């Protein structure tokens, strides 16, 4: 059945992107999906989005800028040490120059970059570029 809603969300937006669509309807939504999208949004890869609140689970409608090539998830969530991070990004990202690994950490959800700053490890969620 449906497990890992995050995965299904980002598949959907990545597809609506390759299709070159303007908006997306991604459902259901999560307090995780939301903070992920937000971290994505601060760097601009996406745009503003709006949460249709239904009495059950969310739907989220996302506005889109062509700036997103790939958006992905890594299942299972792996526990990523600080020391490991390098390896991870060097595997995942197109370049040292750009793109992000998003992890949840004790601090909050964030970018590999910002966590490097805060000196925290955590679990991997996904990545984008």
């Amino acid at each position: 059945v449906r497990m890992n809603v995050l995965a299904d969300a980002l598949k959907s937006i990545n597809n609506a992107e390759k299709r070159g669509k303007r908006q997306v309807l991604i459902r259901p939504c999560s307090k995780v999906i939301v903070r992920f999208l937000t971290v994505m949004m601060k760097h601009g890869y996406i745009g503003e989005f709006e949460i249709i609140d239904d009495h059950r689970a969310g739907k989220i409608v996302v506005n889109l800028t062509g700036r997103l090539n790939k958006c992905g998830v890594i299942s299972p969530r792996f526990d990523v040490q600080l020391k490991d991070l390098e390896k991870w990004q060097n595997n995942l990202l197109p370049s040292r120059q750009f793109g992000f690994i998003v992890l949840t950490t004790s601090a909050g959800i964030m970018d590999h970059e910002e966590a490097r700053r805060k000196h925290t490890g955590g679990k991997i969620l996904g990545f984008f570029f």
């Binding site: 601009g44 062509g66 700036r67 090539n69 197109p94 370049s95 040292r96 120059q97 750009f98």
Partner: protein, 218 residues
């Protein structure tokens, strides 16, 4: 002596188009070898990568011909690949050089790390894909030269890609596809959208729309 038969031709011979980038900007079809030739240069050199015989069969026997693969680079900006079939191998070669010259593409180069000096490698990692060969180029730190097989190393030398991490999987023996794929890869480097290019495009009068008067004169 060269007689231009196209709109783009006249503009070139009449020096109305300063650099090649005014062409690439508007992604015009380049139909005449002499455009490329006049524009550069002694800066062009070329390889015969491979000469392979192909055979067809008729009631009479096998009727043989030749495929030439020529790679024409200008070290540092541009590469081209061309393939030609002919009965006579000579004809085939210079033909393939015409064909290759016709297809020339600009190659983006990025930094590996802190950006210092002039771009020495691929901007981010790209994948050329041709007919079961998968070539993939990856950023490399300065000095590492090109790590790959001989064939894509030729192209990438001629592109002015100085250092690269090449992976290639597939049936990589077959030369046409190896070369055509790696060529794909260095094509897609100006189609890759990074955060650099995020500024909205200010447009420009197309050459055609700009020079149309001096065109009407000829």
């Amino acid at each position: 002596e060269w007689m231009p038969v196209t709109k783009l031709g006249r503009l070139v011979k009449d020096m109305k188009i300063k650099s090649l980038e005014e062409i690439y900007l508007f992604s015009l079809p380049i139909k005449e070898s002499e455009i490329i030739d006049f524009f550069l240069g002694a800066s062009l050199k070329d390889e015969v990568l491979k000469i392979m015989p192909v055979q067809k069969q008729t009631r009479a026997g096998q009727r043989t011909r030749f495929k030439a693969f020529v790679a024409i680079g200008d070290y540092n900006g541009h590469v081209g690949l061309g393939v030609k079939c002919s009965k006579e191998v000579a004809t085939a070669i210079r033909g393939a050089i015409i064909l290759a010259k016709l297809s020339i593409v600009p190659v983006r180069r990025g930094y590996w790390g802190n950006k210092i000096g002039k771009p020495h490698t691929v901007p981010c990692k790209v994948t050329g894909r041709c007919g079961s060969v998968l070539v993939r180029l990856i950023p490399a730190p300065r000095g590492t030269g090109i790590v790959s097989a001989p064939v894509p190393k030729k192209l990438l030398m001629m592109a002015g890609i100085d250092d690269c991490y090449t992976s290639a999987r597939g049936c990589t023996a077959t030369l046409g596809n190896f070369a055509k794929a790696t060529f794909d890869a260095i094509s897609k480097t100006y189609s890759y959208l990074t955060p650099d290019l995020w500024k909205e495009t200010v447009f420009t009068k197309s050459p055609y729309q700009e020079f149309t008067d001096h065109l009407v004169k000829t």
